[PDB]
Amino acid sequence: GFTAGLTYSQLMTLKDAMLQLDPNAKTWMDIEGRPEDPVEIALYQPSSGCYIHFFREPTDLKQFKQDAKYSHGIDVTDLFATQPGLTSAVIDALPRNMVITCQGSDDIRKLLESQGRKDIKLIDIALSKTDSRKYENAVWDQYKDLCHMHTGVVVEKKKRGGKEEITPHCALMDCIMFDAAVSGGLNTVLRAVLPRDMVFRTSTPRVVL
Ligand SMILES: [Mn+2]
Ligand SMILES: [Zn+2]
């Protein structure tokens, strides 16, 4: 009967921040990592420009390393300071019966189900791969400063020929670029809902004991 990980004052700061969301606005959600073990989560409301964006340390390092190599390029060492319990706390605070839009609803559905949020309705936009990435370059160009976490070289698995590096997948850039694909364009200021010191715990020196 408590929210694990966060103290009450942190939780209230989070709940107040989540009230910045318009409960009825189009809201995209995207994750990196499998829904059972997500490492990056984003929600985005293009109307206001509000976005939720945070990270989580993986339970399964082996699968994480595969995903880093072939999908997201996140270095696990940059996840050590993430706030335990944050994913559950954020999802708990989403408005009841909210409608969320996503590209491929299977993984979002599983994540929300695991949090007991079957009340949330999902719209699967079902863009083709090519259509979904139309604005990929434009989105990184404009918004790269919003996520510096994709540091690793990401590759395409190939049977022959040379190495092929690809642009890493970011949950936040995904939301923005999928919305742009649906809207037929990418307008030129977004606003973070969560405080930086909530997403990452400040690290300090220690003597190892
Ligand atoms: Mn994604
Ligand atoms: Zn990212």
What distinguishing features does this structure have?
209 residues; alpha/beta; Nucleotidyltransferase, domain 5; four-stranded mixed sheet; two-stranded parallel sheet; 8 helices; 8 strands; 15% strand; globular; binds manganese (II) ion; binds zinc ion; Nucleoprotein
Proportion in helices: 25-40%
Radius of gyration: 17 Å
**What bound compounds does this protein have?**
manganese (II) ion, zinc ion
Number of strands: 8
SS content category: alpha/beta
DSSP strand content:
5-15%
Task: Write the CATH homologous superfamily.
Answer: Arenaviral nucleoprotein, C-terminal domain
> So what's the CATH class?
Alpha Beta
Topology:
Blueprint: H1 8-18, E1 28-32, E2 40-45, E3 50-55, H2 61-72, H3 86-93, E4 99-102, H4 105-114, E5 121-124, H5 129-132, H6 136-143, E6 154-155, E7 165-166, H7 171-183, E8 191-192, H8 196-199
Parallel strand pairs: 3-8, 4-5
Antiparallel strand pairs: 1-2, 2-3, 6-7
Manganese (II) ion binds at residues 30, 32, 169, 171, 174.
Question: How would you describe this protein?
Answer:
By secondary structure, the protein is an alpha/beta fold. It has one domain: Arenaviral nucleoprotein, C-terminal domain (Nucleotidyltransferase, domain 5). The protein contains eight helices and eight strands. The strands form three sheets. It has a four-stranded mixed β-sheet. A two-stranded parallel ribbon has the order 4-5. It has a two-stranded antiparallel sheet with strand order 6-7. β1 and β2 form a beta hairpin. It is globular, with a radius of gyration of 17 Å. Manganese (II) ion binds next to β1 and α7. Mn(2+) binds at residues 30, 32, 174. The record marks 107 as: Important for exonuclease activity. This is Nucleoprotein. It is found in: Virion; Host cytoplasm.
